[PDB]
Write a protein that binds this ligand. Structure first.
Ligand SMILES: [Mg+2]
Ligand SMILES: [Mg+2]
Ligand SMILES: [Mg+2]
Ligand SMILES: [Mg+2]
Ligand SMILES: [Mg+2]
Ligand SMILES: [Mg+2]
Ligand SMILES: [Mg+2]
Ligand SMILES: [Mg+2]
Ligand SMILES: [Mg+2]
Ligand SMILES: [Mg+2]
Ligand SMILES: [Mg+2]
Ligand SMILES: [Mg+2]
Ligand SMILES: [Mg+2]
Ligand SMILES: [Mg+2]
Ligand SMILES: [Mg+2]
Ligand SMILES: [Mg+2]
Ligand SMILES: [Mg+2]
Ligand SMILES: [Mg+2]
Ligand SMILES: [Mg+2]
Ligand SMILES: [Mg+2]
Ligand SMILES: [Mg+2]
Ligand SMILES: [Mg+2]
Ligand SMILES: [Mg+2]
Ligand SMILES: [Mg+2]
Ligand SMILES: [Mg+2]
Ligand SMILES: [Mg+2]
Ligand SMILES: [Mg+2]
Ligand SMILES: [Mg+2]
Ligand SMILES: [Mg+2]
Ligand SMILES: [Mg+2]
Ligand SMILES: [Mg+2]
Ligand SMILES: [Mg+2]
Ligand SMILES: [Mg+2]
Ligand SMILES: [Mg+2]
Ligand SMILES: [Mg+2]
Ligand SMILES: [Mg+2]
Ligand SMILES: [Mg+2]
Ligand SMILES: [Mg+2]
Ligand SMILES: [Mg+2]
Ligand SMILES: [Mg+2]
Ligand SMILES: [Mg+2]
Ligand SMILES: [Mg+2]
Ligand SMILES: [Mg+2]
Ligand SMILES: [Mg+2]
Ligand SMILES: [Mg+2]
Ligand SMILES: [Mg+2]
Ligand SMILES: [Mg+2]
Ligand SMILES: [Mg+2]
Lengths: 88, 272, 119, 72, 101
RNA sequence: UUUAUGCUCU
RNA sequence: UGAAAUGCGCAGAUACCGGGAGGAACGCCGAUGGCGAAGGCAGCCACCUGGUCCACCCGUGACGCUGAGGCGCGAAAGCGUGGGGAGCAAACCGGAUUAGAUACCCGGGUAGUCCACGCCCUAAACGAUGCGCGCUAGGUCUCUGGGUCUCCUGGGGGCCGAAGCUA
């Protein structure tokens, strides 16, 4: 699983400012972490559909945010994506 | 897996080939430990004694190592997995620390670059050979000897294996690929793991020629012959067998058992 | 082929019949009987009276080889149980104990349509 | 009908320790089954913890899976 | 890494010398997979509720450990390879759940 | 543990 | 079995004991309980992993709701390729019953039931009740969190019921 400092590492690295524990990007980035994890889990355990369900949910959520962010700030949209490697 | 073809000719439509991704830098084989020239001949001294053979691709014989006690204790690295035309299984070229090279029938799982060893010692993992008596009851195994020091004879066909079922004296009880329960001497070497290339059974020759390549000439039915030739020859417009189905030489071929009755071997068997 | 004092009694009680085998201390049957050995056919054998008659013919043949004590063991429901257990005691053979070893699966094989009913 | 709820028959016990038989072997019946909640005096949450461990002990060979009905 | 209790039941008919033999391989295998021992309780012989391997009794061992969890499964497979090892139950450790207190 | 059936319109 | 008959058995059966092989399902716990969106999920262990709730009031600052198409999942049966096959059991055979009995009862029994992979996309797939949000008395039983641990508070699962709704 994603360990505490393991996710902390990410929280800090994307935080819009020392103290930011749930901005748009910190969330997007956070999701991205779990998604890529599961995505690699499902590649192995493919007949595990229930878990894949959540994946869709995590994926769908991530999209909603990014659409908001690219609506309010089309700059740190490119920035966030580029830094995460998303939208293919 | 197994390779398939889009039907750009008939036969190519059903034709299916073996997957050769498992094959490591083969192409040129290992001229030393094998090959030898293989005397391709379809009859004995003079006359045909097995019908319908001949033709088919030329072959070099890879002289494989079917007795591993030959080098007890001496470990070795698996250098490559190779194509061997003389068997259904694949072969594994292995370099011994000795500097001696030998081929082995490649077991399922056996990865390139791993260590292998044989002897009463010998960790119970894939590729290692041991006298049967020292193998944990319940493990699957291949390339077994039938009598000690006489070389492997059992479970050498692609995908085959044998299970150690129990022990009884200086003998252990195997379940042979045929399903037969047999006692084999504990001193007989075996090697842990199934044979591999188990998708073998699933290829489809696809065309007449494909059979020609493998050295199998057309097989003709007694039904298509004349009485001179076969129990089933003659008639006058198709015909049932009109007698118990027979072989060209007269013996029945549907049920009639053929194993010699009073045979020393009988005392060591117990199945199908 | 021998005469042993201490022994063991087995009661197999099914809906259709009751059969009692009496063994040595080791379990090897010394002698047996059932509803049919008494003299009954059909469903008369599933009776508790047939069970009684039976368990006596058992014990009686047991005492022949010299049978004194037993460790009665019953397997299976049915009208044979009690009357068969009782009968034994009420003739020679002192019943040193009464065990119930009726076999029951922890949900093993699926049963016949007849014994499944519910889900 | 009578008897005690058992939970009030022993002191402070760890119903997660699957190794101490004597505490546990008293939660079984004459025949060897896990005793109902209405005789263990345990709660919803406690009864699960118990069984889960009672099973473990059985595998280990400490607690029995079954035993005959004595002197019927 | 995680804390697992490791239960192992051995052949009772073994002699004190052999018993140590079978116990050294356990200890090495334990170390080869990355287990750092903590506690340990070798209760020895013990009466069994049902015969394991046709033997009414069994010699018990108990280890607390902290090993990489991605190797606990493999360890158990290894510990079991021995014939004198007649059962193994690796269990993840837990904070005791108490009643009547 | 042996039964099935009861013409048309009111 | 209603009673029987077919069936099995003096070629040594049933009953009993010891050894072995093999497959499937997991008794007690177990609940009128729990989890999941649904289908559905029940011996034990470990690894990988989804959902969900509570406490704190810490962060983003409407970033929400629904959702034609699309995409995914989808009991049982069924299909393809391999394997597996103990018990059970469509079809099929036999014994009974009956006017007949292609059924009901009995003795046999093959696909199938099991595993891998790939299809099929159905259902009383039922709470016959689409999803989200706010508003409108309470009583009691229960599962599971937090509590200043008689009581309060949050999320679930049941019954009885204010107001109202309903043929
Ligand atoms: Mg000649
Ligand atoms: Mg010559
Ligand atoms: Mg000549
Ligand atoms: Mg073929
Ligand atoms: Mg032909
Ligand atoms: Mg002709
Ligand atoms: Mg001629
Ligand atoms: Mg002729
Ligand atoms: Mg003819
Ligand atoms: Mg004609
Ligand atoms: Mg009867
Ligand atoms: Mg028994
Ligand atoms: Mg009529
Ligand atoms: Mg009328
Ligand atoms: Mg009429
Ligand atoms: Mg009229
Ligand atoms: Mg007879
Ligand atoms: Mg007869
Ligand atoms: Mg005779
Ligand atoms: Mg038996
Ligand atoms: Mg629910
Ligand atoms: Mg349901
Ligand atoms: Mg979780
Ligand atoms: Mg705030
Ligand atoms: Mg602000
Ligand atoms: Mg449209
Ligand atoms: Mg699909
Ligand atoms: Mg389906
Ligand atoms: Mg199905
Ligand atoms: Mg199928
Ligand atoms: Mg098949
Ligand atoms: Mg019929
Ligand atoms: Mg008839
Ligand atoms: Mg007539
Ligand atoms: Mg009728
Ligand atoms: Mg039937
Ligand atoms: Mg049947
Ligand atoms: Mg069909
Ligand atoms: Mg639909
Ligand atoms: Mg339903
Ligand atoms: Mg309607
Ligand atoms: Mg609703
Ligand atoms: Mg809808
Ligand atoms: Mg909760
Ligand atoms: Mg509380
Ligand atoms: Mg409520
Ligand atoms: Mg109501
Ligand atoms: Mg009213």
């Amino acid at each position: 699983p994603i360990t505490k400092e393991e996710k902390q590492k990410v929280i800090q690295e994307f935080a819009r400012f020392p103290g930011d524990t749930g901005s748009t990007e910190v969330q997007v980035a956070l999701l991205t972490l779990r998604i890529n994890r599961l995505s690699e889990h499902l590649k192995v355990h493919k007949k595990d559909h229930h878990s894949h369900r959540g994946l869709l949910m995590m994926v769908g959520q991530r999209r909603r945010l990014l659409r908001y962010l690219q609506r309010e700030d089309p700059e740190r949209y490119r920035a966030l994506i580029e830094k995460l490697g998303i939208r293919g | 897996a197994v390779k398939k073809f889009k039907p750009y000719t008939p036969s190519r439509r059903f034709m299916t080939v073996a997957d050769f991704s498992e094959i490591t830098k083969t192409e040129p084989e290992k001229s030393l430990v094998k090959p030898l020239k293989k005397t391709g001949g379809r009859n004995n001294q003079g006359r045909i004694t097995v019908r319908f053979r001949g033709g088919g691709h030329k072959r070099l014989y890879r002289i494989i190592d079917f007795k591993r006690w030959d080098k007890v204790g001496i470990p070795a690295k698996v250098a490559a997995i190779e194509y061997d035309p003389n068997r259904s299984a694949r072969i594994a070229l292995l370099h011994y620390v000795d500097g001696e090279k030998r081929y082995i029938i490649a077991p399922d799982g056996l990865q390139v670059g791993q260590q292998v060893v044989a002897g009463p010692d010998a960790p119970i993992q894939v590729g290692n050979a041991l006298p049967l008596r020292f193998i944990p009851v319940g493990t699957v195994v291949h390339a077994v000897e039938l009598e000690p020091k006489k070389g492997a004879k059992l479970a050498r066909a692609a995908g085959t294996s044998a299970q150690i079922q129990g022990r009884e004296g200086d003998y252990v009880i195997l379940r042979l690929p045929s399903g037969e329960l047999r006692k084999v001497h504990g001193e007989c070497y075996a090697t842990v793991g199934a044979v591999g290339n188990a998708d073998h059974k699933n290829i489809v020759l696809g065309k007449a020629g494909r059979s020609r390549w493998l050295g199998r000439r057309p097989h003709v039915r007694g039904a298509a012959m004349n009485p001179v030739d076969h129990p089933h020859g003659g008639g006058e417009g198709r015909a049932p067998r009109g007698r118990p189905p027979a072989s060209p030489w007269g013996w029945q071929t549907k049920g009639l058992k053929t194993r010699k009755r009073r045979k020393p071997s009988s005392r060591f068997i117990i199945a199908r | 082929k021998r005469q042993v004092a201490s022994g063991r009694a087995y009661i197999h009680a099914s809906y259709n019949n009751t059969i009692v085998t009496i063994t040595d201390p080791d379990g090897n049957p010394i002698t047996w009987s059932s509803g049919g050995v008494i003299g009954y056919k059909g469903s008369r054998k599933g009776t508790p009276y047939a069970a009684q008659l039976a368990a006596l013919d058992a014990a009686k043949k047991a005492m022949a080889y010299g049978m004194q004590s037993v460790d009665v063991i019953v397997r299976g429901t049915g009208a044979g149980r009690e009357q068969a257990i009782r009968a034994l005691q009420a003739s020679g053979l002192q019943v040193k104990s009464i065990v119930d070893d009726t076999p029951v699966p922890h949900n093993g094989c699926r049963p016949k349509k007849k014994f499944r009913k519910a889900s | 009908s009578r008897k005690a709820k058992v939970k009030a028959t022993l002191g402070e016990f760890d119903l997660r320790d699957y190794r101490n038989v004597e505490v546990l072997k008293r939660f079984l019946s004459e025949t060897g089954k896990i005793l109902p909640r209405r005789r263990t005096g345990l709660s919803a949450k406690e009864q699960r913890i118990l069984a889960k461990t009672i099973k473990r002990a059985r595998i280990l060979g400490l607690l029995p899976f079954t035993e005959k009905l004595v002197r019927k | 890494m995680r804390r697992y209790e490791v239960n192992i039941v051995l052949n009772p008919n073994l002699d004190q010398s052999q018993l140590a033999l079978e116990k050294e391989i356990i200890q090495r295998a334990l170390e080869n997979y990355g287990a750092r021992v903590e506690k340990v309780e070798e209760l020895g012989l013990r009466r069994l509720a049902y015969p394991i391997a046709k033997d009414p009794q069994g010699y018990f061992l108990w280890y607390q450990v902290e090993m990489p969890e991605d190797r606990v499964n493999d360890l158990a497979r290894e510990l079991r390879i021995r014939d004198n090892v007649r059962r193994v139950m690796v269990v993840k450790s837990q904070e005791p759940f108490l009643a009547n207190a």
